[PDB]
Amino acid sequence: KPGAPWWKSAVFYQVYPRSFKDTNGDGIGDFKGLTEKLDYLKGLGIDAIWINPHYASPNTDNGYDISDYREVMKEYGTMEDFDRLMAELKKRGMRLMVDVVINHSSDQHEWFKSSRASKDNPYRDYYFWRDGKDGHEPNNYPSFFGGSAWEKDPVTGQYYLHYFGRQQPDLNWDTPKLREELYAMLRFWLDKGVSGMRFDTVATYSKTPGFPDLTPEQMKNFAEAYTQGPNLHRYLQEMHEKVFDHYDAVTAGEIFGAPLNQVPLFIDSRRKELDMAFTFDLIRYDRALDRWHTIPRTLADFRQTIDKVDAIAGEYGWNTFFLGNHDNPRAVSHFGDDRPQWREASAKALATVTLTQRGTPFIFQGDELGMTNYPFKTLQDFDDIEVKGFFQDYVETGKATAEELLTNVALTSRDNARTPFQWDDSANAGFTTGKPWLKVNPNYTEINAAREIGDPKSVYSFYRNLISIRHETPALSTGSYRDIDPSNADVYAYTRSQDGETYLVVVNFKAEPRSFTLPDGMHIAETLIESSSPAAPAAGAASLELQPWQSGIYKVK
Numbered sequence: 001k002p003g004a005p006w007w008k009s010a011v012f013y014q015v016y017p018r019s020f021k022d023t024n025g026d027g028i029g030d031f032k033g034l035t036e037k038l039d040y041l042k043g044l045g046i047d048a049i050w051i052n053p054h055y056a057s058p059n060t061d062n063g064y065d066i067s068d069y070r071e072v073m074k075e076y077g078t079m080e081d082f083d084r085l086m087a088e089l090k091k092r093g094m095r096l097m098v099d100v101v102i103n104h105s106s107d108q109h110e111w112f113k114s115s116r117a118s119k120d121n122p123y124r125d126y127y128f129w130r131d132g133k134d135g136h137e138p139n140n141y142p143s144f145f146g147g148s149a150w151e152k153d154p155v156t157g158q159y160y161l162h163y164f165g166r167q168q169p170d171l172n173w174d175t176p177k178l179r180e181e182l183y184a185m186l187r188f189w190l191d192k193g194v195s196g197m198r199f200d201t202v203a204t205y206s207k208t209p210g211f212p213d214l215t216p217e218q219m220k221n222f223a224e225a226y227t228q229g230p231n232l233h234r235y236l237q238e239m240h241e242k243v244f245d246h247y248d249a250v251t252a253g254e255i256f257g258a259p260l261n262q263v264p265l266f267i268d269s270r271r272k273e274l275d276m277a278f279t280f281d282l283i284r285y286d287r288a289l290d291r292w293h294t295i296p297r298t299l300a301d302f303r304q305t306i307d308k309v310d311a312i313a314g315e316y317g318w319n320t321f322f323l324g325n326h327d328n329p330r331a332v333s334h335f336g337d338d339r340p341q342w343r344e345a346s347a348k349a350l351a352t353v354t355l356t357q358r359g360t361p362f363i364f365q366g367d368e369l370g371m372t373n374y375p376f377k378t379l380q381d382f383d384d385i386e387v388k389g390f391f392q393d394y395v396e397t398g399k400a401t402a403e404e405l406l407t408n409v410a411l412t413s414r415d416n417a418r419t420p421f422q423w424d425d426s427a428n429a430g431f432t433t434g435k436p437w438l439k440v441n442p443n444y445t446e447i448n449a450a451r452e453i454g455d456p457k458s459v460y461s462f463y464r465n466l467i468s469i470r471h472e473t474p475a476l477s478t479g480s481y482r483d484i485d486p487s488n489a490d491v492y493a494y495t496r497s498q499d500g501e502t503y504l505v506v507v508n509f510k511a512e513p514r515s516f517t518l519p520d521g522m523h524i525a526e527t528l529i530e531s532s533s534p535a536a537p538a539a540g541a542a543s544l545e546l547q548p549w550q551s552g553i554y555k556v557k
């Protein structure tokens, strides 16, 4: 019938430009660095790149505090450099997705400087200003990055709202003039050729009228509460109608905090809101409610979450799929086994998973090499503003010791994902000729692009091969998905089907040998690929013998 939109069959790579490639030795990656490496990304098989924020910013939160939405961050380069990136991507037939951060701006944005000057400034309701209560904050709202979500301003005596950093005042979507300004800013980039937009914390745009205090229950999970604004979808539909209706850009919502069952409201194509979702049920499936502790899970929980998420897409919706990003620990460390003897095998098995999932996959920079968490030794080793927030909220309050915080954030901190890309084994893994803004992982001597690119057996080569297979196998992108045994906690097994063709994906998550018995009436037809396998099954095989961390994709009859 109709073909599938390009984005449903594409493979995306996420670049965090601050930590990708530096070309002027200042220790921070830039545009020229990324443009120099498009041949590398093209070679991997990448169709589209999502870059983290690249706009003018004080960098209190590395790009997510934007001080001017129409200028390029001075660290990344100039507008000319940005256009050059765009041109060079097009030459390779690649597409760019930019990050859109409009839940909040920097406090150095001209809007907010105006806003805070007086209660009668024309920009006063571009943000949220309220009177304190009982000599306190307007209410009990906590901030993601520590302390109250209300900062008092001596200039007027009132408090402004900030879900995140104090230097990230929330934008007031209730004001139509603000919305119209945001819509114009979006066109500015869209008119430049941008192929896609990912929306930062898209679900927190609408605020609760009256700002009543959160219940104690709500305080336990405040992130979810902030996604329950009564006008949220009215605003997203308006944005689609006034902007995305006139372009052919793909839209991707970061739906952080929302209960899974509300996700279809964002992505159902009929609702004319967003095209794709980034959900966090999977990546935070073993994260405690405080967002820094870990809870033990098994493969059963992993696969069951996936099943739930996939079913939420339904017939008219569409999911992204990812195992890593700039806000989360490294995929091989988190979901695999980063011990030296299991790192490569487990990193390949997760690749097999990532690239055979129903949805649009995003590969986070470095995971194609099998980069790992970083061995943090003290709390001063973290740049992240969110860790400082945990220290404020849990250490300074005596709820936990600094040692307890450290033990735990070492495994969960975003900074695990932000150590410089490991290009070779020159000084600082070839990321910079100067001093990196965040220290490079010492394992760069073993884990680096230059060593993997030539080696047919490397983690890179395996990802490259999977990207080829997927590209050539329609059922592996847009096919149906079925978990064969949601209760099995050793071996992940499922099928992808399209137009009478069925493929079986089988992945041992155990560091021990395991067996797998195919469903009654199903038999192996071909073996497309395996990792950690000494021999493929035989045509006709009705069961599989699996090595530790073995993965494979098979066409069945």
Ligand SMILES: O=C(CO[C@H]1O[C@H](CO)[C@@H](O)[C@H](O)[C@H]1O)[C@@H](O)[C@H](O)[C@H](O)CO
Residues within 6 Å of the ligand: 061, 064, 101, 144, 164, 200, 201, 256, 291, 326, 327, 386
């Ligand atoms: O609220 C969000 C959305 O993150 C987005 O919004 C944040 C602020 O703009 C930014 O820091 C992130 O990098 C961006 O992706 C959570 O991811 C939260 O920041 C925290 O990481 C969860 O424990």
Ligand SMILES: [Ca+2]
Residues within 6 Å of the ligand: 021, 022, 023, 024, 025, 026, 027, 028, 029, 030, 075
């Ligand atoms: Ca630089």
